[PDB]
Write a protein that binds this ligand. Structure first.
Ligand SMILES: Nc1ncnc2c1ncn2[C@@H]1O[C@H](COP(=O)(O)OP(=O)(O)O)[C@@H](O)[C@H]1O
Ligand SMILES: Nc1ncnc2c1ncn2[C@@H]1O[C@H](COP(=O)(O)OP(=O)(O)O)[C@@H](O)[C@H]1O
Ligand SMILES: Nc1ncnc2c1ncn2[C@@H]1O[C@H](COP(=O)(O)OP(=O)(O)O)[C@@H](O)[C@H]1O
Ligand SMILES: [Mg+2]
Ligand SMILES: [Mg+2]
Ligand SMILES: [Mg+2]
Ligand SMILES: [Mg+2]
Lengths: 344, 518, 518, 519
């Protein structure tokens, strides 16, 4: 497998799901083995993957070769411990020489050529070398955008790789925004808006209720009418408080009901619901807003800015998705992958 | 020494590609008998519960229904389903082309050619073929009559390989009309296909309005002139106040009687607020209970109970109203309009007929055959035709069908191969042979001299006549410009790219490791 | 010289389908015409049925071949479209498939056979239209003739003199015979009760209930004021959580007295409107009738009917002209149903039946009650009545009447053979086979009656060749005679639907070339 | 850039064959040299053997892999041609197959490997032949040294003082060292009987019989006249169907009298020739001895021995000098063997033997009798004596002698690696692998002796690189030293045949690329 001329491995799991992959870590991952040394080699590949993410097959092949030479040596009546000591000594020598041999490549956004070349080298031997040029560029740009250079740390939770079938591998792009597998509620509202002040929100558009168990006793028709008025004014005040901050778009994590959806429609304020927690956090980091847990503390300065939000249909099927692009400065990006197969 | 498991095995040699090739060829040979205007469909029978029976022609549902065992067969079925999702046509074509690519691949690897050499040759060949197809694509959309004729041709070529061919002249235009009612919106759910048994398949018609499979209430009228429809998504049931934790805790029966009277009065006032909009029709999403139905009947309006999300969405599209939930301000976004709400009977059932609709943004197609399987196949193939028509409305570029586009792109591959040295050239020649194997199959299923027809097409395309293909009603070499066997450019491009990609991904496996089943 | 067509599985599958269809047709061949005797079907559980309708025979019999399943779907579709001929359509389809098996053996492509069958059907529809005569309503004689013809091939034939006039009166008392264009059978409620004999069947212009009177003190009401109730006559309880707290000894007396006063108030408001018989909707989650409420109703000399199904409210309202109430404040005599008499009749110890008869308000609904010794004859009698009603529905749908007893299809066979003799080519044999495969019906009618099939069919062909149209098999004479003078006629829609549906399903069957297990 | 060779089945088959051959080799690798211990084989039935012979170890151990069967056949072929070194040959074959699996991993065609192996064989034959020295027979010292070297790695090593001189006496008493060019081992008859210890093995120039004398009145005969008999001493009976009819009362007495007279006449004809002991051949279908005949023979004071197998008559005639007699008229003293003494010897209550000693015409034939506590040690002593006899046979066949103790193969490994350093190309790696694949024998000689293998092999290579040839591993000294001074030598035929057979076997195995399971 190792090398640009290597060949893939196609594994089926215990349910009947096929994965055609070349990554040594993954290939060893679905390789169910009983022999203990095979388990140790699988753990070796997984650890090399976790520490680096590159050269998973290389370390496995190197360990196999080292053990084969060790076998040939101990055939000549030598202690295994001496073989291990020699291996460690030679590894020290090789590490020192590989320190001596190397050079450096400048890592800045101003010039992205050596980074692209290294990413291109890594992307070789994988099928995505069909393109092999634009995917390296998008990977480099994603890492450079997300990375916090002062701390010299890259947070992989700010990159949201998502794949959707259809199209071609040419469509694999880097959105400097966020994409979510949701859609605007109440399909009458517009499918797109221009630069929008977004109201990132968590609590649902429903009448409040304390977490502690409670019993609101209603004892007369006057109390019942007061309860009806309380419900109606709660909805109306909630919607007017959303509107008064100037937001053109709202996002709620926990979803809501019809009596809220019609109010959001009739006030020309689009919004989406049932957005996941990590999706909410990514939206907040991208659009620059702040997550607010209550309507009562939604100010003008807690909103985010979005260049444009779009509803995208994705072919003949009815799976609509929402994409947010052109933030003022997006520290979280999205990698979108498309193809003619699930396995690809 | 064996190390894996009990039930886990590994094929790390020619055995792996043997299994992959035989599975892909089995998929191709099963799907192959359903191409062209003369293809014959198949019966799918389930050996499990309910013994489901379905008569179908397209390869997508044939491949998805059967339980494939070989992983390569799973690859082909997934590719077919993905391609059906993307465009909705050419699933059989893409599966067949991939099968022939794998067949030529095993033939090449018999000649001791490294698989990566074949991969490079195929990449170059598909680049050249895609470039040639794009160069040969004709476009419309600026024109009005010519584009409508092109749409009719696309519907005809998409619908001629299915059962509706028996009445193709009637159906194609109908499908086109349906898409012409979408007004550019890529919303296929705006099309409703109601299938009722009884009568010939030529009794199918696209309605001049909308049809709803719901029921009027008890005391509401069953016919309206100059309808003013309000579409809502309110409760109209018991309609709890939604303040969880609210209960009546009183010390007399008079109190609870008063509270239930207050509940009924709040429901009455909600109905009054609804009626204040100035309506004579009312369509609700969820149920309408007995008291609101009685109030509606007394007022003199018409109410619809339990019209699901799709129903209210289609009514909003076809009438122009908004999905209301709160009726505080009737002065805001307004109602819809129609001209008749007559109840019309089809077969033995009654459906609400919205005629004289304000907008044509949605419509219904009534399918009426003589067998449930005929209804299912008509529905699936009509869905394919509508998918293709919507896709070509979104992107009006078209290329000629009948193998003409395939012949020209194979010719481009051959010309590229002739000028490339090494063992790449034989790889591209095999690519061209596999690509030309499609019109051969269409002629075979038709039953003509496939070799003679393909040789004639090769000569005509090498000479320069770039609009030559198979005339199947007579079985000769004709001109697709004059005849009018068009096809969507997007469909053919997706077929080519998906098939080449699946062949490339399958070909580069040299080890199949199967874990022990659950 | 020609295509080798190495694959032979399509031929095997086609012959298997044809053989299965022919076997299914032959299975019910002996259940056709007046002399055909019905089948007996017992399913997996120990339940039996004595069925002569082809749709029921085919549905109950759990077939396993795909051709058989397509045939049973064809039969049920023909029943839905027409309601009569569900045996003849299956017989025609199987017979002409058996005809086309030798066409397949003669070296003819299935597509040519399908197209030629379509052309033959096109000619046959025109032949049937020419053979017919106009039929117009208010002519009770021809309606009775059609009903008797529909009922002749059933067990209730000897009762047809006392069962067909009411069968056509049911339809004539529901729809206006001037501008109808369709009728509904939903508002023809067939109520079946065990006991008595068939000669005790009845047609009532009023309403029939299988419910029982709760207060066993009042049985008959003269000048009845019926009022539906949709709310509950029990202790009050709100939709949301209901609770009463008692803290003193006087509170128990207060709650008991208040509940009694509330119930008495409701019953007094019900009684003060002049309502003398009450109909309570079957309510769950709240007791529709309380024992105290029922006691008060009985005290004020009223008749109470409770546990009425929700889906029957529309039927009751359309019958007796009442309007449902869901709130006591809207219970007024201005919208209270009225009838001349309400009776509860014991059916000689076999059951208890409620009749609302003489409804002063107009009623566009009738009810048929069917009586029989055992349950099997009751089921077959209601099925036969349904067949006669469907025949009258066919007459209403399109006004065209043709002769029967084998005459239409034998005349069609002659005309289509003469048409095939002027169609030189490969389709001449196919049209000839279609023409000669529609002689199966007269042959079956001849052999089922004990006649000589060869001589009967030959004499029928000779008689129709001389232009003596509307000449067919007569089982009273035991030979061949003019059928119109024998008073046997059927609507044209049955024959046309049978022919068209059979041809379309046969073309669909011919399009099949493979079966695969999913 | 070359043939794809899609089918990986041949490579997998070759790797499987190499692995199986290596497994068989290193299974018995621990049974090499004067410090390698013998195995115990218990087959499916209730039979056990304690064996150090490589051929017998491989035969009894019923292997399954085809390559293992090829190796056991190679060992038995080497036993046929040489008789010693049947373990070193299989070790060499397995070791150099193990070396060539790496070559197969380096992308070298099997045909190239086979041809290079053949060329290395051709060079090694020359190296070994030049390394040796000519040897002349009738030199007791070199014969004794070779026999002791053959016997050292066997269980009878502690008895080498009593077995080597008799092992060389057996060979020297069969052939004439002037013009022999070969020796027939059939006339070295090995007889085994339970009892005693290995130290009571004996060599007799006479004849040894396991039969028992019919008459227990005479057992010791001095100046005996032995005569073989191939006819039956019973009542006369013709080949065709025979019947005697009696119709009188005198007929019974007459027929008994004629039978007695005929038997007595035969016995008198035998006796009048001076015959002193009688050897009666085993005759089925006709009792060669009757009660009347044995009675008469015992009356004439003679020794009678019966049940002599037909296959031993040639051995008896060649040993004591008698000639077979199938007719009474031909029985005379001119064809009657003679011996100085015939004895029935008791082995301290553990059986009985017949010994003919002092034959006046000593033929080219001797016999060896072995003594032991249990059956297993007796069988192992027989195998060791046979191996020593085969070593002397090889030394007689071609007169050439080489040093032992790892010297020949290590010197060949050197000379062949400097030969490989002159053949740069694709075959250089294969010839170097062949050269370094025969360092296994000295390595295992060092390992089984408890020495450090790596240092011992390094010192061996260094000392043969300095021209101090005939240097090898000494287990008495516990180090490395000159081998001829230690009196350890072996005939050139042993090593040359071992190398040639191993190389041929490997070249044949390397041509396999598939296996099919026949019905
Ligand atoms: N009437 C026709 N004449 C000539 N070629 C046709 C005709 N209809 C379809 N084809 C060709 O047959 C191929 C497959 O058609 P079809 O079976 O409709 O595919 P699908 O089953 O995916 O709809 C298409 O590439 C098209 O070029
Ligand atoms: N009295 C009759 N005399 C001659 N033929 C009849 C008579 N009654 C019915 N038939 C014929 O018997 C055929 C079968 O009719 P029937 O069994 O009633 O329903 P189905 O058509 O569903 O089998 C009809 O085609 C009709 O022409
Ligand atoms: N006394 C000894 N000192 C060192 N090496 C010896 C001695 N005796 C035998 N050898 C070596 O042991 C090797 C194997 O001999 P042996 O085990 O007797 O026969 P086989 O190889 O058939 O088992 C010979 O090559 C010889 O060089
Ligand atoms: Mg890598
Ligand atoms: Mg199509
Ligand atoms: Mg009938
Ligand atoms: Mg030896």
């Amino acid at each position: 497998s190792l090398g640009p001329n290597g060949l893939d491995k196609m594994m089926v799991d215990k349910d009947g799901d096929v994965t055609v992959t070349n990554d040594g870590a993954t290939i060893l991952s679905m390789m169910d083995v009983d022999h203990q040394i095979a388990k140790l080699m699988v753990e070796l590949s997984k650890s090399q993957d976790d520490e680096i993410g590159d050269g998973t097959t290389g370390v496995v092949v190197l360990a196999g070769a080292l053990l084969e030479e060790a076998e040939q040596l101990l055939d000549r009546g030598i202690h295994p411990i001496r073989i291990a000591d020699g291996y460690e000594q030679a590894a020290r020598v090789a590490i020192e020489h590989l320190d001596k041999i190397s050079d450096s490549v400048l890592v800045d956004i101003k010039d992205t050529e050596p980074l692209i070349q290294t990413a291109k080298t890594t992307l070789g031997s994988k099928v995505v070398n069909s393109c092999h040029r634009q995917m390296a560029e998008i990977a480099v740009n994603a890492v450079l955008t997300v990375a916090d250079m002062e701390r010299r740390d890259v947070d992989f939770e700010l990159i949201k790789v998502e794949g959707k079938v259809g199209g071609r591998l040419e469509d694999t792009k880097l959105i400097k925004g966020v994409i979510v597998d949701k859609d605007f509620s109440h399909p009458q509202m517009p499918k797109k808006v221009e630069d929008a002040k977004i109201a990132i929100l968590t609590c649902p558009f429903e009448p409040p209720k304390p977490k502690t168990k409670h019993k609101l006793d209603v004892t007369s028709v006057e109390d019942y009418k007061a309860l009806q008025k309380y419900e109606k004014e709660k909805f109306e005040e909630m919607i007017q408080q959303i509107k008064e901050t100037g937001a053109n778009l709202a996002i709620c994590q926990w979803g809501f009901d019809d009596e809220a959806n019609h109010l959001l429609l009739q006030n020309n304020l689009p919004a989406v619901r049932w957005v996941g927690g990590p999706e909410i956090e990514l939206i907040a980091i991208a659009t620059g807003g702040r997550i607010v847990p209550r309507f009562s503390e939604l100010t003008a300065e807690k909103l985010g800015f979005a260049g444009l939000v779009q509803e995208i249909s994705f072919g003949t099927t009815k799976d609509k998705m929402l994409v947010i692009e052109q933030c003022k400065n997006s520290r979280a990006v999205t990698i979108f992958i498309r193809g003619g197969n699930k396995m690809i | 020494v064996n190390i894996f498991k009990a039930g886990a095995d590994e094929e790390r040699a020619e055995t792996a590609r043997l299994t992959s090739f035989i599975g892909a060829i089995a998929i191709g040979d099963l799907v192959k008998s359903t191409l062209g205007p003369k293809g014959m469909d198949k019966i799918l029978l389930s050996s499990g519960r309910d013994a489901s029976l379905m008569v179908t022609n397209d390869g997508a549902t044939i491949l998805k229904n059967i339980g494939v065992d070989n992983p390569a067969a799973k690859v082909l079925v997934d590719m077919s389903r993905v391609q059906d999702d993307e465009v909705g046509d050419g699933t059989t074509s893409v599966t067949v082309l991939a099968a022939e690519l794998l067949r030529e691949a095993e033939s090449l690897i018999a000649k001791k050619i490294h698989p990566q050499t074949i991969i490079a040759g195929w990449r170059e060949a598909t680049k050249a073929a895609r470039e040639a197809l794009l160069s040969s694509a004709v476009d419309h959309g600026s024109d009005e009559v010519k584009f409508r004729q092109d749409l009719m041709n696309i519907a005809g070529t998409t619908l001629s390989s299915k059962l509706l061919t028996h009445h193709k002249d009637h159906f194609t235009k109908l499908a086109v009309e349906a898409v012409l009612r979408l007004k550019g919106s890529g919303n296929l759910e705006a099309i409703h296909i109601i299938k009722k048994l009884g009568g010939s398949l030529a009794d199918s018609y696209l309605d001049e309005g909308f049809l709803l499979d719901k029921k009027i209430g008890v005391n509401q009228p069953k016919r309206i002139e100059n309808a003013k429809i309000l579409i809502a998504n309110t409760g109209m049931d018991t309609d709890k106040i939604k303040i969880f934790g609210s209960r009546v805790r009183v010390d007399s029966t008079a109190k609870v009687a008063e509270i239930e009277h207050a509940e009924k009065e709040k429901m009455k006032e909600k109905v009054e607020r609804i009626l204040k909009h100035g309506i004579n029709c009312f369509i609700n999403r969820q149920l309408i209970y007995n008291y609101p139905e009685q109030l509606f009947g007394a007022a003199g309006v018409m109410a619809i109970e339990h019209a699901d999300f799709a129903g209210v969405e289609r009514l909003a599209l076809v009438t122009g109203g908004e999905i209301a939930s709160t009726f505080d301000h009737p002065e805001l976004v307004k109602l819809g309009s129609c001209k008749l709400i007559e109840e019309v009977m089809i077969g033995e059932d009654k459906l609400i007929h919205f005629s004289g609709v304000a907008l044509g943004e949605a419509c219904t197609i009534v399918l009426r055959g003589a067998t449930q399987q005929i209804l299912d196949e008509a529905e699936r193939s009509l869905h394919d035709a509508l998918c293709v028509l919507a896709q070509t409305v979104k992107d009006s570029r078209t290329v000629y069908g009948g193998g003409c586009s395939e012949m020209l792109m194979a010719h481009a591959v051959t010309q590229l191969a002739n000028r490339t040295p090494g063992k790449e050239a034989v790889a591209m020649e095999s690519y061209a042979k596999a690509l030309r194997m499609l019109p051969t199959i269409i002629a075979d299923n038709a039953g003509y001299d496939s070799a003679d027809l393909v040789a004639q097409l090769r000569a005509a395309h090498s000479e320069g006549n770039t609009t030559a293909g198979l005339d199947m009603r007579e079985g000769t070499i004709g001109d697709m410009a004059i005849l009018g066997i068009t096809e969507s450019f997007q469909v053919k491009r997706q077929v080519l790219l998906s098939a080449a990609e699946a062949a490339e991904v399958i070909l580069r496996v040299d080890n199949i490791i199967k874990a022990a089943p659950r | 010289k020609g295509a080798y067509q190495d694959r032979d599985k399509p031929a095997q599958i086609r012959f298997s389908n044809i053989s299965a269809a022919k076997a299914v047709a032959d299975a019910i061949r002996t259940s056709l015409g007046p002399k055909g005797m019905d089948k007996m079907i017992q399913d997996g559980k120990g339940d039996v049925t004595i069925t002569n309708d082809g749709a029921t025979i085919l549905k109950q019999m759990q077939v396993l071949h795909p051709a058989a399943r397509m045939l049973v779907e064809l039969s049920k579709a023909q029943d839905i479209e027409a309601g009569d001929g569900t045996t003849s359509v299956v017989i025609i389809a199987g017979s002409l498939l058996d005809s086309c098996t030798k066409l397949l053996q003669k070296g003819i492509h299935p597509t040519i056979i399908s197209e030629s069958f379509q052309k033959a059907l096109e000619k046959g529809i025109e032949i049937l239209t020419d053979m017919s005569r106009p039929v117009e309503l208010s002519d009770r004689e021809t309606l009775l003739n059609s009903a008797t013809t529909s009922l002749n091939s059933k067990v209730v034939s000897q009762y047809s003199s006392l069962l067909s006039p009411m069968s056509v009166n049911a339809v004539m008392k529901v729809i206006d015979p001037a501008t109808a264009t369709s009728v509904d059978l939903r508002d023809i409620k067939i109520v079946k009760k065990l006991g008595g004999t068939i000669d005790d069947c009845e047609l009532v212009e009023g309403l029939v209930l299988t419910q029982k009177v709760s207060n066993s003190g009042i049985t008959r009401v003269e000048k009845a004021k019926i009022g539906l109730i949709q709310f509950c006559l029990s202790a009050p309880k709100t939709d949301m959580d209901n609770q009463i707290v008692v803290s003193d000894y006087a509170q128990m007396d207060r709650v008991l007295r208040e509940e009694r006063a509330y119930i008495l108030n409701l019953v007094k408001q019900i009684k003060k409107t002049g309502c003398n018989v009450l109909l309570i909707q079957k309510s769950i989650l709240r007791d529709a009738l309380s024992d105290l409420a029922l006691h008060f109703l009985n005290k004020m000399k009223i008749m109470v009917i409770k546990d009425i199904e929700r889906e029957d409210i529309e039927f009751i309202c359309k019958t007796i002209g009442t309007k449902p109430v869901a709130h006591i404040d809207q219970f007024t005599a201005d919208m209270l149903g009225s009838a001349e008499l309400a009776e509860e009749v014991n059916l000689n110890g076999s059951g208890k039946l409620l009749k609302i008869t003489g409804c002063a308000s107009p009623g566009k609904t009738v009810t048929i009650v069917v009586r029989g010794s055992n349950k099997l004859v009751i089921e077959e009698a209601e099925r036969s009545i349904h067949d006669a009603l469907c025949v009258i529905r066919c007459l209403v749908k399109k006004r065209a009447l043709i002769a029967g007893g084998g005459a239409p299809e034998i005349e069609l066979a002659l005309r289509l053979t003469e048409y095939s003799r002027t169609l030189s080519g490969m389709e001449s044999y196919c049209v000839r086979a279609f023409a000669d495969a529609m002689e199966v019906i007269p042959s079956t009618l001849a052999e089922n009656a004990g006649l000589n099939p060869i001589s009967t069919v030959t004499e029928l062909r000779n008689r129709h060749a001389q232009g003596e149209k509307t000449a067919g098999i007569n089982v009273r004479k035991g030979g061949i005679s003019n059928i119109l003078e024998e008073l046997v006629v059927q609507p044209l829609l049955v024959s046309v639907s049978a022919l068209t549906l059979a041809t379309e399903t046969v073309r669909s069957i011919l399009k099949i070339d493979d079966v695969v297990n999913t």
